[PDB]
Amino acid sequence: GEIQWVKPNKETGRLNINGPTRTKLEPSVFHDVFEGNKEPAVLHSKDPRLEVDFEQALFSKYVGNTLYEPDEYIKEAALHYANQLKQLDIDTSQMSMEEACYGTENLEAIDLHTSAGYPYSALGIKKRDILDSTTRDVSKMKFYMDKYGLDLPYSTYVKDELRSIDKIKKGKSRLIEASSLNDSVYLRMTFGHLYETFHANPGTVTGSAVGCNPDTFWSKLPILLPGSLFAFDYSGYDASLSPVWFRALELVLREIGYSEEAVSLVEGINHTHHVYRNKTYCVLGGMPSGCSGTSIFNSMINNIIIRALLIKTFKGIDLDELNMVAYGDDVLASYPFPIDCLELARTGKEYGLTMTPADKSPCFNEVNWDNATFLKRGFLPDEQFPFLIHPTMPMKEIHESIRWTKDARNTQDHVRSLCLLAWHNGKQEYEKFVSAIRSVPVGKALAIPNYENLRRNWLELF
RNA sequence: GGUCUCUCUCGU
RNA sequence: ACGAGAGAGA
Ligand SMILES: Nc1ccn([C@@H]2O[C@H](COP(=O)(O)OP(=O)(O)OP(=O)(O)O)[C@@H](O)[C@H]2O)c(=O)n1
Ligand SMILES: [Mg+2]
Ligand SMILES: [Mg+2]
Ligand SMILES: [Zn+2]
């Protein structure tokens, strides 16, 4: 991805979009009980913690575009992936606006607790003023689609979240592109059935982990992914995507049966307009992260990416022996022979992609179940039943979360959630985490889950 | 102050 | 089942 132009809002006639500049994150009562190295991300340009210009740091992620049209590796890759998807028999028919707005069994309803985007957000119009859970009224929605139409600009806000100190010093906060409700609706109508299929089928046919539940999914993955593991990270995936991957996405969609009107919508996320503050800017390439389908399309593109890299980097690849599961840019994959990722990475560079050793190691090492991670979790066989696999969120990560809150009112819920993540690491580590939580007055006021209950509730899932 | 997923909690 | 809230992940 690459910023094509920037114009003031006077010149484009776009309403300014300003977001908050103060973090809602405050240190929790456990801040000094656990060690951690993250803080609230830089939200404002005059943040004393800065060491670089903010805005230039924020937008440096648009590293530019290499390929615009599919070469022959990418084509072959798209087709292999699309043929794989066909057995799922995705219903390419348009989803009704009522189902799109208000949801189904395999698609959650549009979030009514979340902004409505351009232009409503500047007009004081919330999602709740157009949609109603109980009514399932679609009438005002239709009315607004007509008034403001589609392809409305994304609103750019900075994400309020904890970031490692290095990224705070270097102003590398993340940006989210707040969709217009109109585009969300329309994209859900076009692909809601695809969404439903993906959510209902995490695994190696979708090649996706969206919809997965780590407690139960981590036990399938060594069966789903037989042979030699490989994995890596992308640096700035969404923005690093060149238009070719959107061309590629299109070919997959066509091949599984989408109408050209349906397929045409891809170009409207490949080429987007964004309002950040008082300006309008144009982005060519790059997933507008915040659009409907972000996760699924990233996952799909990722599947295309992996195949294309493999048959370009190596001789005699059999794509049919490829297994992979993607969650956006997060990948875990296997093949009957070990795959050298340093070379995949060299090839990816030519495509504008930046690929780094699993977990930000210094170098590309062997990936095995003992050191693999996916969705930040490790893989740890249960000592009693070794075919049942724990997803292990590292305690260091759990320590970062607990040291802050955005509202201490919900402390109880927060610590409980962490415990649900922590116990997988084992009895000894878990009680250590609990005893440290207990070491402080608020901590002694909290209901903390009993370990063996957690374990036995885990086992009962199977 | 986005798209989504998973899980938990509290209600009726 | 329907409502509200939270955490986590991409
Ligand atoms: N809160 C998030 C996090 C991630 N993503 C999507 O998932 C991809 C991968 O996210 P991640 O690997 O966690 O971050 P990067 O964007 O690769 O890294 P950076 O922090 O450098 O931007 C992104 O490209 C983005 O499209 C997202 O939509 N929302
Ligand atoms: Mg990445
Ligand atoms: Mg990973
Ligand atoms: Zn443009």
Side-chain angles (χ1 to χ4, degrees), chain A residues 1-9 11-21 23-45 47-359 361-462:
Chain A
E2 172 172 69
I3 294 178
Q4 297 306 295
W5 48 263
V6 190
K7 298 178 183 145
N9 281 359
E11 182 181 349
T12 60
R14 293 297 183 189
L15 308 164
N16 282 15
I17 282 147
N18 295 289
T21 45
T23 178
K24 285 248 173 306
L25 281 157
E26 303 181 344
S28 75
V29 301
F30 308 103
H31 188 102
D32 308 324
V33 159
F34 299 95
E35 293 159 35
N37 318 304
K38 293 183 164 186
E39 294 168 30
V42 182
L43 260 45
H44 186 285
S45 203
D47 197 292
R49 298 168 301 157
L50 274 175
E51 290 194 358
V52 292
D53 178 33
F54 194 22
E55 292 198 0
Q56 140 210 301
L58 289 178
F59 293 79
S60 60
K61 62 163 178 176
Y62 296 100
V63 296
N65 293 324
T66 64
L67 217 53
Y68 291 78
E69 223 70 37
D71 57 24
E72 295 285 298
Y73 303 100
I74 285 166
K75 282 191 200 170
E76 189 182 330
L79 274 54
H80 182 275
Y81 182 45
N83 276 330
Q84 175 178 310
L85 294 183
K86 288 173 175 177
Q87 65 189 293
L88 292 161
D89 275 282
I90 300 154
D91 172 12
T92 53
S93 75
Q94 177 163 292
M95 180 176 269
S96 77
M97 192 182 298
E98 197 213 286
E99 267 174 347
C101 293
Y102 294 107
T104 66
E105 178 198 10
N106 286 307
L107 171 60
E108 266 310 306
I110 301 181
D111 187 334
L112 295 177
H113 302 124
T114 266
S115 185
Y118 197 95
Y120 315 112
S121 190
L123 303 188
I125 305 157
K126 285 140 152 20
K127 251 140 158 183
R128 268 150 184 303
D129 307 331
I130 311 176
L131 285 182
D132 187 274
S133 188
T134 44
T135 325
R136 287 174 94 82
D137 182 43
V138 70
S139 172
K140 271 225 167 184
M141 201 70 256
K142 307 208 174 200
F143 164 71
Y144 278 112
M145 315 271 328
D146 296 26
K147 161 157 215 54
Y148 298 109
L150 306 131
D151 285 323
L152 301 180
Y154 289 85
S155 312
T156 304
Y157 301 96
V158 188
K159 185 141 159 168
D160 194 6
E161 62 180 359
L162 294 167
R163 301 283 268 156
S164 85
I165 276 309
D166 180 55
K167 288 121 147 196
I168 286 174
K169 285 182 181 176
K170 304 188 164 72
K172 250 142 185 174
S173 307
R174 315 199 286 171
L175 296 179
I176 55 117
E177 322 302 328
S179 186
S180 169
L181 176 63
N182 286 18
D183 294 309
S184 303
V185 169
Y186 193 54
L187 277 164
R188 289 170 75 109
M189 297 180 52
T190 314
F191 301 107
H193 295 314
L194 175 137
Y195 297 172
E196 293 170 317
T197 301
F198 268 71
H199 302 171
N201 294 275
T204 51
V205 178
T206 59
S208 169
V210 176
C212 115
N213 174 23
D215 286 327
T216 52
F217 196 66
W218 265 226
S219 288
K220 306 177 183 193
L221 278 171
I223 320 298
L224 292 175
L225 310 184
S228 311
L229 285 192
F230 65 101
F232 48 83
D233 300 331
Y234 293 87
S235 279
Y237 187 81
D238 67 4
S240 72
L241 295 173
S242 307
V244 61
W245 299 121
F246 291 88
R247 294 296 86 78
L249 176 60
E250 285 174 343
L251 307 169
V252 169
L253 286 181
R254 203 170 279 129
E255 261 290 315
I256 66 183
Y258 281 104
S259 68
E260 221 59 30
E261 143 176 325
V263 178
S264 61
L265 299 208
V266 173
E267 177 53 25
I269 66 176
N270 165 54
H271 170 216
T272 62
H273 288 160
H274 306 245
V275 178
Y276 177 62
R277 290 186 100 196
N278 53 350
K279 297 182 175 199
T280 299
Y281 61 103
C282 181
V283 181
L284 182 60
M287 184 72 61
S289 310
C291 75
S292 177
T294 299
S295 270
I296 285 172
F297 298 138
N298 283 346
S299 300
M300 284 177 71
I301 280 150
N302 208 334
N303 270 267
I304 307 177
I305 289 168
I306 293 308
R307 294 161 167 77
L309 296 181
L310 286 165
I311 65 177
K312 183 173 211 262
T313 296
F314 305 119
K315 242 194 72 154
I317 287 306
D318 189 11
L319 284 189
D320 287 351
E321 301 293 318
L322 174 63
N323 313 91
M324 70 172 279
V325 178
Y327 205 121
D329 77 325
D330 214 338
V331 207
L332 198 56
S334 80
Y335 191 78
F337 311 104
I339 286 307
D340 196 79
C341 290
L342 174 62
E343 311 292 343
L344 287 175
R346 175 168 134 89
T347 315
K349 237 306 161 170
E350 297 161 37
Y351 285 134
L353 302 161
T354 298
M355 297 159 44
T356 156
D359 283 287
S361 305
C363 48
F364 293 100
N365 290 126
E366 177 219 325
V367 171
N368 44 75
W369 296 106
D370 277 22
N371 68 4
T373 63
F374 187 53
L375 313 173
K376 270 202 213 170
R377 293 124 156 129
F379 295 75
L380 178 57
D382 184 77
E383 280 183 337
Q384 186 175 358
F385 308 100
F387 49 91
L388 298 185
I389 308 295
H390 289 286
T392 39
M393 178 81 51
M395 293 301 316
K396 180 178 211 187
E397 296 302 298
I398 285 163
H399 292 163
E400 299 287 350
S401 180
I402 197 176
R403 299 177 69 233
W404 304 84
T405 168
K406 280 180 174 178
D407 189 357
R409 281 160 250 174
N410 308 297
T411 303
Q412 173 65 87
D413 280 38
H414 185 186
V415 175
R416 186 176 157 82
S417 285
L418 300 184
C419 297
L420 295 183
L421 291 172
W423 81 270
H424 283 294
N425 292 312
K427 225 293 207 277
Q428 182 146 55
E429 281 299 303
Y430 186 62
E431 292 304 337
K432 177 174 186 275
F433 178 55
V434 164
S435 143
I437 290 169
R438 298 303 199 189
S439 82
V440 129
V442 158
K444 299 167 190 291
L446 305 187
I448 282 123
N450 158 257
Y451 179 88
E452 7 291 313
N453 295 330
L454 285 164
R455 186 133 185 290
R456 135 186 67 218
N457 292 326
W458 188 62
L459 296 154
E460 265 152 35
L461 293 188
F462 307 87

